[PDB]
């Protein structure tokens, strides 16, 4: 039916791979070896829009990361396919990359790659737990799924200044989150910029909810979190998006004061048939 | 009234900065040490969407960066402040973005820059001249500089695979740039996926002229071409990559078979007075 | 009294640490804040031979890494201080560093650091199992601790040609171990090249035993192993590397086909107080 | 009959190659193509001790960089090739960089690159003139010209910390250096510490005279100098680097405050004959 992207244990890992088309020609051997290792659950996949066009073919629901006007940035960085890893082994998500890198030979060249871990269980590096409101069981499958059992992702790789962000007073931190730290609480009394004030699945006229699966990172240009949004359609993360960047009421989050994306990527996730993936609509 | 854009000889050395705002609270002592450095001639400036959105203030023919849905990759990586430092010494150039760093501290944090270089007279690392169709003198003041002495520069930083370029024989290589490179030649028979067919000025519905202000640039992301377009607007350089990535008539580029963009950037470049820069549109 | 340094199951994830000594007159104050944190589990502490230089005191079997003039690279990068951070959490690892940086902040200055992993169960990122023939219990003891609570550490950061040594035959790779991948057999006739046959410790004059407690790693500088051995001297590593770098007979360790040490260096682990680590000698 | 290593207009770009011998059995057909191109003009040669080592080959007065017992880090990353490219088009050095890897491909691999520029006319990164005591026409083939015409050149990449240096007031940086920055004046009352007073080359008792041929580096590392000193021996460098770790008279190089040295190589530069480069002592 559907990839397994809500399954309730995460893995201590993740490897997401972002690919360039730089051969199209080359493309039917690329995907002879792909396909038969797309089980949803160890590897899963994600068309992205550039690859949608250059085969001349249109995916309802699909189009590219959006751009957004704002005072804030929100870079648009659209890649053809994405590769997400999952595994409890951080070696054996590398060995595998290495072999994925190799078998998509010239068709598909890496673009850029994130080597997450799972914090805690489900913490951001600054030590709040993330995963909190999001759905579960059947709600997750209503708010994630579509129909026909695909999924549509957001991906964002976004950079915190940790050394910023813990020399704020907790009051202050508090107040960027929305939420205490201490012991999860929500403030009611958090200002309106305030994260969890911005993106209140309930607050919005049509239910914004969706299905979060991020995690942290750390390399050479710093560490924060890999954000991973999962709906029925891009409308939830995109109107969620947009009132985080003040495009709605003029408030921007609080996340802006300490963290800032540095990608963005949006990518359909076909569904599941009983023999393998189907990829058929686009082949 | 306008600034060194089109200064005759190109100093050897250039350096790009881009800024992103952290912290716009802190914006006036960030404005009041940048200015009185803002010459034009060897510190130029400019000014992206979200810095003007976070000010409130609507700058005519000023936006993001665009998103083109096709089947090669334009990244958008719009950012606040671009400032672009000329001079034919490189360690002069690399002092003074570490005092510019620390003049704008905590209003503006350096989110990307880019240490490039003239290579040779004005040739790319291919080896092919770029420039040879530039306007010149009074044409480029038409063609790069609106009415009230202002400029709209589209950024972009260019990755390039050599060793790839370099394996294609040379009749291969002259195909895709649609240039001889024995004698920098028009190639007139060459395929319409040629750099030099899809860009020719004169093909466009209005007449796309720009003035275009490459260097060479190379580090630890690669080597390639740091692309500068400047226009009385953006709609020369916009029409120009529309056509490049195949949006017209399906026709792509030969440049991307070897070639692919990491950046992408519109800024506003404002006008000088005789006082020094005018940025009174936008205080 | 011994740091916890041969504990048996190893934690999942590393983090090896480097100081130089920049400011010799606010050392005080960073063992004032550092020293209570060294408990010789999740924290462990080396000093390297410059330190003991700085105070004046001298450690007996304290000495920096060797140079070895033979054909295969074994740089000598010594160092002030090593911290060995252990723990089955990378993020809990991460923010550690921030907080030991910031409070070593001016007396000392981080040079390098390692993020380790442990690959499946003690592997090898080629495959190979290491640690076959590595002593236990109380030989491990005795090969790995002095007379007093202290220990001397060998590190070595190896980075790995896997594209090239996955690309060799089975036969040729297990060749250049000494040891066969599909079962961990120790090959009888692999030729004097072989690793083991060049470090098998019950083939020198006085019996060279040594505790390995190596990682893999994998960042911007490739991917490879991250090399420690612990013995109640140096004598033991210092005479296995020599005859692996063909100092001895001329022969040179297969290893050296496809990996190569990036850095050495050579620490002297206090032993435990039940006041916390026990610096005396130096004081 | 030795390599253009002391050519006067120093050209504003550089860039050092240092090669790991990966494979010693593609050695013969990786020189064939490398000796044809080494001119000691806009293309110098260096070679290590690993290389002499695997060819089975003494070099008289070719080791390793030093081990230094000292308070201060010297590292020592000894390499088995040194490739010195000079010119005035940095695209140019590395479009030839690109190159010579294919050309030198499976016995030799590039370890470790470092993109040189001469700052201002020989100044550096901190605003210091560096070479205002470097001996200058006949008297630099005396200190840096062995009698066969080689050289034995010592390299260091060191790391300034410039945001450190320049915060100290300029009397302080004065002190450190042992010149005054505003006029390059020379500080008769410095501190012994001072790098001028610590590297005095006729406060030896033999005279430890060198040619230093550096220029400024910046990447993601960071920025400062790529040390380059050329000898007739090691024993120059060797012995005014000991001064500067204390192992003298205790007393350390006031450089050390803020700036350390990431890496270190001893390179032997062979003579030019009549048919180009001359590595005969080693390819009989
Ligand atoms: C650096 C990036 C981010 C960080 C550190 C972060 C962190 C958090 C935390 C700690 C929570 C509270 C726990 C929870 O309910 O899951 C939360 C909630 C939430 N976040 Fe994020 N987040 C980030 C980015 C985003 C983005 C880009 C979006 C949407 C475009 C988003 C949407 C949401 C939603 C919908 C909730 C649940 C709010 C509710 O219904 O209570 N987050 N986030
Ligand atoms: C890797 C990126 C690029 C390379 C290597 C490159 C190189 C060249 C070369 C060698 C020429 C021929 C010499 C000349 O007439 O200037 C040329 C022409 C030109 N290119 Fe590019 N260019 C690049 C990107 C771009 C982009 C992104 C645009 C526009 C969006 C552009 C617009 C033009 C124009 C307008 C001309 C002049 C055509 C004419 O009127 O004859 N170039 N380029
Ligand atoms: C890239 C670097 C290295 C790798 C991948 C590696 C891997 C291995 C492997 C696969 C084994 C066989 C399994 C075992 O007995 O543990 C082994 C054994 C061993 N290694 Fe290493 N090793 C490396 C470096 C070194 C170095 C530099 C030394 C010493 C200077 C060393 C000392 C030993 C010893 C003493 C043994 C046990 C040999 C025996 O008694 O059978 N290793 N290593
Ligand atoms: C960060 C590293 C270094 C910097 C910034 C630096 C800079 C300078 C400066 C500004 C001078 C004074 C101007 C001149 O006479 O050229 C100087 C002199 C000198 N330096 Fe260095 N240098 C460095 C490393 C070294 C090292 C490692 C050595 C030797 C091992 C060395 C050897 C010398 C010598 C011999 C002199 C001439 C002293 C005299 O006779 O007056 N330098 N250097």
């Given at each position: 039916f559907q990839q397994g992207l809500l399954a309730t244990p995460v893995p201590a890992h993740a490897r997401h791979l972002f690919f360039t088309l730089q051969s199209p020609e080359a493309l039917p051997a690329a995907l002879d070896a792909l396909l038969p290792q797309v089980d949803g659950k160890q590897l899963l996949l994600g068309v992205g829009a550039p690859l949608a066009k250059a085969l001349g073919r249109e995916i309802p629901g699909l189009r590219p990361f959006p751009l957004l006007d704002a005072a804030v940035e929100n870079p648009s960085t659209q890649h053809a396919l994405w590769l997400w890893l999952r595994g409890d082994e951080r070696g054996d998500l590398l060995l595998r990359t290495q072999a994925l890198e190799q078998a998509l030979a010239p068709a598909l060249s890496l673009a850029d790659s994130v080597d997450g871990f799972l914090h805690r269980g489900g913490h951001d590096l600054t030590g709040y737990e993330d995963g909190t409101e999001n759905p579960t069981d059947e709600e997750a499958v209503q708010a994630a799924i579509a129909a026909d059992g695909s999924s549509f992702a957001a991906f964002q790789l976004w950079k915190h200044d940790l050394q910023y962000f813990?020399?704020?007073?907790?009051?202050?931190?508090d107040n960027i989150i929305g939420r205490r730290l201490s012991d999860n609480e929500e403030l009611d009394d958090a200002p309106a910029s305030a994260h969890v004030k911005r993106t209140a699945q309930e607050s919005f006229e049509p239910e914004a909810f969706m299905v979060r699966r991020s995690?942290?990172?750390?390399?050479?240009?710093?560490?924060?979190?890999?954000?991973?949004?999962?709906?029925?359609?891009?409308?939830?993360?995109?109107?969620?998006?947009?009132?985080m960047s003040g495009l709605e009421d003029g408030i921007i989050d609080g996340l802006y004061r300490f963290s800032r994306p540095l990608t963005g990527g949006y990518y359909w996730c076909p569904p599941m048939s009983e023999t393998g993936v189907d990829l058929s609509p686009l082949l």
């Open positions: 813990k020399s704020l007073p907790q009051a202050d931190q995690v942290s990172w750390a390399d050479q240009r710093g560490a924060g979190l890999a954000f991973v949004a999962l709906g029925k359609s891009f409308e939830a993360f995109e109107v969620q998006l947009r009132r």
